[PDB]
């Protein structure tokens, strides 16, 4: 499970993503959208070109859930009970996209603190968002 | 597969930048450190008790940087890899059968740890490039299973 | 790949024997049951809202029985799979975008449907033979994305 | 999550499996051995030959830890937390492994039950057997 080590570690590095979660958000979509095309097909209703204000508001909900996630991790099914009916239910979202973009936050965030996402970090963080990516994928099992 | 200008260009330009032996032994010690089963194939290795210990295991480093050596055989014939590893795949299906789920966890911690290094010439672009490149590696490997 | 005698043997004898319509239908309502995301991708189908629903679904069980006919097409053609479904690897990659590891949970669906049906022919070397078949289907579908 | 439902489907299915412990077990150790090789090398101490006394013994062991899955469905964790250790810790398990045993133990069912084995039988066994392999691999996160 996740210790408290791994929850202060997560923490140190969220409030930095917190200063500016339409950047840190859009840009994890834009490199799913573009490393794997696949994931596009979800979103035909959006503008997809780069900076759009649909990408970068969606990026900003992403980063904003993911958010409410990092406070209550001891509650994750419960918190993010809405969130999961939805990705389930009505977006039929496949499963292996939910690690498509954990991975690439993750590359957001190795780009974004270079040096300080160190492995014990990242170990953090892959907890984190399997964690979270269980959860939105629960409806289904 | 098949390699365009561009994305050749974000191979090679990147690779001649990197410190294979930092990157190397990064990624091998986040291998074992955040899949930790993967440590079974490295019985002979010593102390991987602790992710500190990993990091500071001579022998990970060391053979992190002969795979990342490994990788860029890879950038440097991208249009014949799937012959450049078909050495490689027996010896890790045939030999140490190993699951060919985890090259694919590996070429993810190779991506990741560019990533950290790199920050400003790994666009999104140059990410698509390079995890086509792991993908292919991946593969190349995968095919003494198939 | 590569087909010894025993296992073409294992794979011809078993599938001259199955209720083509049958199976397909069984192994697409299962797999729009077990995998319940895989409903997204069959819109115009109507009714899929529960387990009964989807099983007396006469465009499902349509089109598990033409879904099944191809992997006959595979069992017809052994030596030359990654050949006859390059068509439908277009389609499935470039137009369905149907993410790859969902081919081989059909395939996994397709084992334990034959099974059901074929107790005592179903062997463990049986078995062998048929997951190298599903697997190869599945990864000649895959191509169109590697 | 298992419904009622899904738990009853379970039990009407297992009294049957609970009968024949050795067989079932050692039907699907001997499947994912065939059929997976690879997984052979976890048990290079094991005679692997067809029915041999440890491939029997090991497979009503299995069968026996299942069927106290089963009866402590809703305390499954706690239930396997010695197994969990020791598949984690000891034996070093890939993940990937528990989907393939899984998947056979369902070949055994299906071949077993035949017509009996409906898609809800199915439905139900592989939430089962895939809340069973989270547990078994949860002290890797
Ligand atoms: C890190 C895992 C994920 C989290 C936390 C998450 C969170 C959210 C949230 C909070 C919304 C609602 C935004 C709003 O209310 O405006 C949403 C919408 C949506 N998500 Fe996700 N999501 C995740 C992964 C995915 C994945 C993997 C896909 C598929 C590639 C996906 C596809 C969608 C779609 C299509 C919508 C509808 C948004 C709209 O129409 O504006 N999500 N997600
Ligand atoms: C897919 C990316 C990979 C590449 C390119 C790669 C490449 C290599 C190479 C070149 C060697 C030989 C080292 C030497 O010359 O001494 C090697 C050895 C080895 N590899 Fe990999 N490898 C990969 C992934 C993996 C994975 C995912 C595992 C399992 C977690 C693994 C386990 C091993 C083991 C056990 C050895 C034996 C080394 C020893 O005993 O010292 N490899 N690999
Ligand atoms: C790997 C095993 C599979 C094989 C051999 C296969 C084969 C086929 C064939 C032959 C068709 C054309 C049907 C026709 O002639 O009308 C088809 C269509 C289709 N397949 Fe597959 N398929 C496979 C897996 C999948 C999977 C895993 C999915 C997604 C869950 C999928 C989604 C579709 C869809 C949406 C169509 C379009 C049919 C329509 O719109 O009516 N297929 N497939
Ligand atoms: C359905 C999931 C599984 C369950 C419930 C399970 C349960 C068990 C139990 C109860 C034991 C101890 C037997 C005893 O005390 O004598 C055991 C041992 C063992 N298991 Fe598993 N197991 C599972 C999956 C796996 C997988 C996927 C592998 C790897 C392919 C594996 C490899 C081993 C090994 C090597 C032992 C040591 C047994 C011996 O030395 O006799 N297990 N397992």
Redesign the interface.
């Known amino acids: 499970m996740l210790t408290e080590d791994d929850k202060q570690l997560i923490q140190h590095v969220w409030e930095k993503v917190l200063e500016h979660q339409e950047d840190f958000g859009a840009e994890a979509l834009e490199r799913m959208f573009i490393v794997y095309p696949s994931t596009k097909t979800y979103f035909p209703h959006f503008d997809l070109h780069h900076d759009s204000e649909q990408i970068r508001h969606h990026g900003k909900k992403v980063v904003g859930a993911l958010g409410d996630a990092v406070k209550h991790i001891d509650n994750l099914s419960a918190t993010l009970s809405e969130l999961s009916n939805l990705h389930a239910y009505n977006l039929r979202v496949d499963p292996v996209n939910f690690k498509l973009l954990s991975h690439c936050f993750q590359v957001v965030l190795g780009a974004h603190l270079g040096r300080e996402y160190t492995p014990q970090v990242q170990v953090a963080y892959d907890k984190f968002l399997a964690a979270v990516s269980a959860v939105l994928a629960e409806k289904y099992r | 597969?098949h390699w365009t200008s561009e994305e050749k260009q974000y191979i090679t330009s990147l690779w001649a930048k990197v410190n294979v032996g930092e990157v190397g032994g990064?990624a091998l010690?986040?291998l074992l450190?955040?899949?930790?089963?993967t440590?079974?194939f490295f019985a002979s290795f010593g102390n991987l008790s602790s992710?500190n210990a990993?990091?500071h295991n001579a022998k990970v480093l060391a053979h992190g940087q002969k795979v990342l050596t490994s990788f860029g055989e890879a950038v440097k014939n991208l249009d014949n890899i799937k012959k450049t590893f078909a050495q490689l795949s027996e010896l890790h299906c045939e030999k140490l059968?190993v699951?060919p789920?985890?090259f694919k966890l590996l070429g993810?911690i190779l991506?990741?740890?560019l990533?950290?290094?790199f920050?400003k010439e790994?666009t999104?672009?140059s990410?698509?490039a390079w995890?086509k490149l792991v993908?292919?590696v991946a593969?190349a490997l995968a095919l003494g299973y198939?």
Do not use: K
């Not at chain 2, 450190?33 to 089963?37: A, K, Q, T």
């Open positions: 597969v990064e010690a986040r450190i955040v899949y930790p089963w440590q079974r992710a990993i990091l059968h699951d789920e985890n993810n991506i990741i740890v990533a950290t290094h920050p790994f999104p672009a990410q698509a995890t993908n292919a593969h198939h």
